[PDB]
From a paper:
[name] was recently identified as a voltage-gated chloride channel residing in the thylakoid membrane, where it plays a key role in photoreaction tuning to avoid the generation of reactive oxygen species (ROS). [name] structurally resembles its animal homolog, bestrophin, a Ca2+-gated anion channel. However, unlike bestrophin channels, [name] lacks the Ca2+-binding motif but instead contains an N-terminal charged helix that is anchored to the lipid membrane through an additional amphipathic helix. MdVCCN1 forms a symmetric homopentamer, with each subunit consisting of three domains: transmembrane domain (TMD), N-terminal domain (NTD), and stromal domain (SMD).
By the structural analogy, we assumed that the conformational change of the Tyr332 residue triggers MdVCCN1 gating via the hydrogen bond interaction, and that the [name] mutation may mimic the state after the conformational change. The overall assembly and subunit folding of the [name] mutant are quite similar to those of the WT structure in nanodiscs, with RMSD values below 0.36 Å for 335 Cα atoms, demonstrating that the [name] mutation does not affect the overall structural integrity. In the mutant structure, however, the Glu195 residue flips toward the central axis, and the Phe192 residue in the neck flips away from the central axis and resides in the space occupied by Tyr332 in the WT structure. Consequently, Glu195 is directly exposed to the ion permeation pathway, and thus may affect the anion permeability. Notably, this local conformational change of the Phe residue was similarly observed in the open structure of GgBEST120, while the other neck residues remained in the closed conformation. Thus, the [name] mutant seems to mimic the ‘partially opened’ state of [name], whereas the whole neck opening requires larger movements, triggered by the conformational change of Tyr332. However, the Y332F mutant exhibited greatly reduced whole-cell currents, whereas the [name] mutant showed only slightly reduced currents. Taken together, these electrophysiological and structural analyses demonstrated that the inter-helical interactions near the neck region are important for channel activity in the [name] family.
Numbering used by the authors:
A (entry chain A), B (entry chain A), C (entry chain A), D (entry chain A), E (entry chain A): 78 to 418
Amino acid sequence: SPVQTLISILRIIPDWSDRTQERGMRQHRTLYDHEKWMHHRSSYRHLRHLLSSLSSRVILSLIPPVIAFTLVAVVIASYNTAVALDLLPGIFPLLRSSSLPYQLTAPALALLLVFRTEASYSRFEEGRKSWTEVIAGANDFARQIISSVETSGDAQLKKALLQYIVAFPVALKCHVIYGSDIARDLQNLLEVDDLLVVLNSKHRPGCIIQFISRSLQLLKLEESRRIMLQSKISCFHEGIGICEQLIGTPIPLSATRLTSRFLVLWHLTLPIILWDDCHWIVVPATFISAASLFCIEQVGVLIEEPFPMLALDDLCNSVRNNVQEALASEKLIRARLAAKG
Amino acid sequence: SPVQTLISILRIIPDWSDRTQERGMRQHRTLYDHEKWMHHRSSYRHLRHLLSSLSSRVILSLIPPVIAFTLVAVVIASYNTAVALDLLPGIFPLLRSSSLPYQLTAPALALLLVFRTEASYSRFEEGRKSWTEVIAGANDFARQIISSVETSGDAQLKKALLQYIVAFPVALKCHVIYGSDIARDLQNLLEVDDLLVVLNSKHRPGCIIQFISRSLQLLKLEESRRIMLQSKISCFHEGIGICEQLIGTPIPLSATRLTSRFLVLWHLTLPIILWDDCHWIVVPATFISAASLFCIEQVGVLIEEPFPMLALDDLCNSVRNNVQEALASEKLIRARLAAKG
Amino acid sequence: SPVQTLISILRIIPDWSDRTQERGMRQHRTLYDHEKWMHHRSSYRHLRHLLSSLSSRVILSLIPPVIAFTLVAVVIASYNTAVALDLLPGIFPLLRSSSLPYQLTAPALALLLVFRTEASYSRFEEGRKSWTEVIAGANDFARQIISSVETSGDAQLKKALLQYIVAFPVALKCHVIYGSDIARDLQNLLEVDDLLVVLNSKHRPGCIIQFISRSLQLLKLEESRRIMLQSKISCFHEGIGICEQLIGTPIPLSATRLTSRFLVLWHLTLPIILWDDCHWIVVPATFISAASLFCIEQVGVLIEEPFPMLALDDLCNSVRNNVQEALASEKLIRARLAAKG
Amino acid sequence: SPVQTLISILRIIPDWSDRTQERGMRQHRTLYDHEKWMHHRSSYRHLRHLLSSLSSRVILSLIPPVIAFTLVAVVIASYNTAVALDLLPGIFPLLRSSSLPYQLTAPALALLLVFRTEASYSRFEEGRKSWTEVIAGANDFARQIISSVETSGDAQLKKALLQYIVAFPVALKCHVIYGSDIARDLQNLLEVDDLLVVLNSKHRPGCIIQFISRSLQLLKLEESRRIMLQSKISCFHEGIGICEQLIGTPIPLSATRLTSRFLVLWHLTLPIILWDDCHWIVVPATFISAASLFCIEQVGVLIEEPFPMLALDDLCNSVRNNVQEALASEKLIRARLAAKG
Amino acid sequence: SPVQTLISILRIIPDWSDRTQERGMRQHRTLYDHEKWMHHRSSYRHLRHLLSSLSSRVILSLIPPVIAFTLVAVVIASYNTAVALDLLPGIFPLLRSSSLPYQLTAPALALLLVFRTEASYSRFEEGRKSWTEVIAGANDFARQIISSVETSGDAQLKKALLQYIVAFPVALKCHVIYGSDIARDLQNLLEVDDLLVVLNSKHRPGCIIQFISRSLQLLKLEESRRIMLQSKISCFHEGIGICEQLIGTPIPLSATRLTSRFLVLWHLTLPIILWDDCHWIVVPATFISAASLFCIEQVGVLIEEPFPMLALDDLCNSVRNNVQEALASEKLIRARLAAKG
């Protein structure tokens, strides 16, 4: 109890930081337009970023490691100040050291920290390209289905097939985001009986592909045209593959634990080597170093699995908006090209 | 009012800098030719870049953050000089510190600043390749349409289809540049009734694709030849996808706010750590450091969304010039190859 | 014997480290899901990584080089302390040097160490993409076989062909992992007589491809449809090629021996240059430098051949689970699309 | 005149440097073979590069910026020496400063300089791959035309078509090199009347493509075989696109002017901060720093537009040599494969 | 003679180093297997690399530049020691300087050295991927020929065609390795009369392609199947293109001479700036700096043209072994799939 009521009060702050950053992963993102870019490039961005630093969830996640190292700096400083005043027995030395060992290893720590964050940014870029390809393939496939499928006996199957190409990016988004309601997001895109078959499947994006693939086998098409249409499905399998490996396989964990351990050991003895030159400036110096260096690691950690930093709902809605515009433009494009003739 | 007439005079300079850089985003760019490369590689480039530094809009955007840090250096220096002359009560210490904490963290700041600018340059390169592919696909598709389409009953549809392949890059350029007049830019490329249907569409580059796709369904072609032609449309969907994700999804904003915050905190205490070694040289030193380090961040910020730094009007005009040269060379190439035979 | 009983006691620790890390290469990995990402991003990761540092097998592999350099620091320190007390003849100088030569070469060592680890991480990423492509191709090929193959006379050949597409990733996994039992892993995927032919082949993933390729020649298909199906086999040859070159061709060994030699020479004279500023702090300083710098090299060494850090059994089971779900959804998707009609 | 006869004598050296480097862009390059690699890897390369440093045109281009900064170092040193001897009124201070501000910003300058040169090398690599693809596509297309085209009535058209595939890389080389004589380079590759049509076209590589595309429409081919042959033309459009964007779009000029300005300001005050430690060694120190740091920038500037550093004439001659060897081997390969049968 | 008998004794060591490294380029390499990876990752690699440092040919190539700089350090040290003892007239100053100029430029030298070696490693990776693609294409093409070619009248042509797909990687290996005996390496792969036609061709890998391309025109195939088979030849043209550009076009030589010149000037004045702090420790310090920094450049130089560091004979033998296993498995796979039916 005496070691169990103190081990629980120490968890109050890290638990709050953990609850705060997870709520920030569930925030809804929006695509940038032109006026958001003007605000992004403004000369006031430096002041407004500094003023928004106590509402940023990166900095709130950094509160446990920054306070822990700052108390260690205060403890080392208090002990050193007490020794300098001869308040201790005399066997107790001053916890000081040369900064030369840290000068030699300072560029290695920086290069390793930036390497891990560059590896994390590469995973964000790969996630962004994969979604770009899936949305451009869904737009392309839908555009070709509106042109290719001519026969009036295939009106219902063409309608059904265009509903599954719009539903596929929504299914993939629900497959990669933790609390997702695919039933709610597909309620007005799929038929009531089509959505029951998808909801009974463990791999829902896989199930929509199978409806698309079976629909292309039932259309009255020449075989050359069908091979052209069913070659557009492979981008959906590629999308599923790339997105599932980014959630399944993180950056090799030996590299991420090395960056953690190196940053913890460096900030544990940093007050000891800074003492001769700084004295009690070790406290604010350790505070600023821990806040600056653990924030480079925190940025990389938060974008390592990148699907919650992407506006997947706005990208999915673009395909739906593009397909309904094209079904309304069809009579007026057909008329104009018949007039040409 | 007393705190509201001073909060407004402080906005005069950042508002001017913001109006100056946005006007520089709307400047018209031209493709480099050989004599511009000779001028670019000249030994006078070092002098002429230095002389053009007060007309460069990067440096004008840097005027608010550089003056703000320079006044902070002047305030810290004035306070320190007043303390050294014993003009203050005596409880007021000298704002000085060891430079050793900044020596240890100097390589981390540099690596992070160059990482953000490299990420911005990667987005410029991706925007450049995407336009290269769309212009080469428009040239290829047009070249094949001039060869493939033979039948004299399809003369008007071939004319119409070649107008939409030239119009597509203009539509995509108007779709990614903020103040664009697609009606003015397509006035002499599309028919009056064809341009009305495009102007009524929310996704105009999408609408031109649908005219191309419907035109290929109405041509008297063998099915194998039609599949070959409609496979050339996918580069247009890819172009739309890549260009829309560069405007919709910026570099993850946690990484860009970290570079901003780190640069602001570093220049706020930089006069304090430089005092013992520099005294009033903290003012020009802080001026040069803020101007040098915030300019690396400013370059990255301005090319992060890269379409205004690209000569999209000259690249679009190349496709138009290439297609009209090919329609004039057609009778003389046909004659020469008939002579061979 | 006197030089042969001491040369054997020195091998006790490196042999134990070598047996410990190899047992860690044979540990079974699991795909990350959402709750493992929450635990990965927690604010307690910094404390729990530090507490798990004496059970991490990277650090146990670092035990021989870190102790060897720490004893060298103790030997140099003991000799220097004995000279300072005039316990030696007097011809014996103090083993001290300026740190200026190491200050000039410190950034070169860091850049080279991070380059070798970045090259190793690039090989891990290439291994990860190759598996992503092979699993997405196996999913795509299986999905098309379930749609394409219609004829009821080809029921047994379609069953057989879907067993070989699920078996191929298991065969490739057994081909790249050292102690593998392909007979045990293919016992319930292949027929008893089909598995005997695969087990008699030296290149088992190659043998499964040949069964797939022969099965596509015996199906009653139109030739255009067969060419479409046999074009899906090339991703399996590409998978075999990429995976075999990662095991056959390491990072050029001249670059890896340079990083080893540079790190050994740097830690051999590091106590000599640190003495004037540190005295007996050369022992913990050399301990921390050797542990920090050889751990960056160790991470790169352990992920250089990356297939044991990948959850190849879970990725292989995903294809098997996806194909059996699709064979159970087939009657209910066929019914729904017939109802449409 | 007094300010106009001195402004002209100062241009003598930069004009000479500009005339010298442009003449080096027009030098003819040759492909490396095995004995040039042995000479390239020799242990004498370090001495022979140092001895050839006053004939290297990079160093001659660096002569204006290196002399300008060296005279500034001499002026600052002369003024400081005159002040130390009390030869001035006494209101004149010594132009000295702490080197600490430059120590903090030294790693930022290095990282930015190497980033710009890496961006320039990436443009050289992209230019090299684009030429590799165009030459391999010209070899592939020619090889297929020699096999595919069988009919004896198409002998003259097959001859003509193989002349245009060899002529296309020569036309593209003349299109990207400033003083080119396409008439002289195509005089023995094209017919006299075919070369007149190409010379009358503004986009000559585009004109050759149109002859190839029209020749494939006039051959007596099955449609499936023609689609296979005309799919080999797209690599030529891709080649034109990639090569034209490298000449049209340089590295964003905001990034290149920042590297210029940073290097000029750094070498202007470098004698002032080096004085206390170096005195008149500021002159050779500034000379070596300006020569070393402006040479990293000069290398990047000279390879930024890379087509003059590539042996485009030797790569073009390889396609011509490969096609004539294949037309002489045709009777003896046909005989051997008929003997098999 | 007096200046000609001394200019020849100085060439003894660089000539020996040049003869030693070229003999190391001709050593035969073997593919890594699992037990070589265990030995590669062992904790004894740090000791065994250090012990093998006087048999490594990188270090033997470094012997001329390391001895030359070490004698310069000995000459500068001897002159400085003689001046300190007043053994000279007195007009002779001490060759000493501040290390501050080298501290500012130390990170630029390191970044440039690692950039050149990263560029060299990128050329090794490109060479490795190109061979991976050619071997996977040869495996794929052979696998399809064994399935596709059915007719019993084409037995000899199928045999011949499978001999040319195995012979092509051997021909490409002989085309990129300096002393190669293509006649000896193709003696048991090609027919005696087929090998005479290949030996009479200047571009032997090109000649084998032409036999493959002519063999596919003589087979009794449907045209759709022939187009599928002749599309597998393009990877051979791509392989030839990528491999020839790596031997023809080195890293731009302006960048490689800059790294050479910078490293030579840096080690020439390094004893002068290290003297005040080191005295005769300038000799071992210059020895270690020259050995460490010129070894990073030497690694890059030796892998810049990478084909001799690749096990091209083992990769070529894998295709031959895979094709003969598949011709022996053909009767037993045909039997098993006929039993299914």
